[PDB]
């Protein structure tokens, strides 16, 4: 649908990944990732319902993405510029 990311969105995400570590990926994998991204959007919506801070933290702890809110804002700091994480740390 509208939600799954286009080719350029995945290209920018993998540009961030390349900044983290140089990784090479081909073209048709982007379409496959778009289809599976619609699937994973459904997966995450069923994983995370009405948006609550504790609910989201528990869901991401169960999913293995994070271990606690510490890893929450640590990943936020890793993936984003400074001011947004100043806001996050004020919130978290």
């Amino acid at each position: 649908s509208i939600k799954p990311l286009q080719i350029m969105d995945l290209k920018h995400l993998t540009r961030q990944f390349l900044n983290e570590n140089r990784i090479i990926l081909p073209k048709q994998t982007w379409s496959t990732i778009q289809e599976e991204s619609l699937n994973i959007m459904d997966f995450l919506k069923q994983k995370i319902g009405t948006l609550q801070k504790q609910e989201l933290v528990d869901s991401f702890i169960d999913m293995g993405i994070i271990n606690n809110v510490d890893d929450m804002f640590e990943l936020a700091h890793e993936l984003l510029p400074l001011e947004l994480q100043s806001r996050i740390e004020s919130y978290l």
């Binding site: 649908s1 459904d42 069923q46 995370i48 319902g49 869901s59 999913m63």
Partner: protein
Amino acid sequence: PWEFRKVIQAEYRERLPRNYELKHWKKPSKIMIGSILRLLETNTVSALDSVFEKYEKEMNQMTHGDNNEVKRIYSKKERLLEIILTKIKKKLRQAKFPSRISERDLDIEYIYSKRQFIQNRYSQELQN
């Protein structure tokens, strides 16, 4: 029960594991709820006219040609279906779904035409 949520959660538990965080129920998008609903009313109204026309012969057979009372019957069933429809609408408002399904992919007039086109192309190719 009438509530969709209980059966929805039970079948989600059947479909998906326990480490899967099913305890969090996504609010479905209003467009998704509207599409599921609209499919429901389209099916209901189509079958409604089909059934009301199908038994009209037998109905006139046993009703001894009373038209005011068949109008009464039609109106009675109409607002029965309206009340059931309002109940289904509110239960779907409280029913939880992932928002990725479109009504266009579950109407039959599109998929049936696609199948007919595919088989016509197959026939032309085999003749060639």
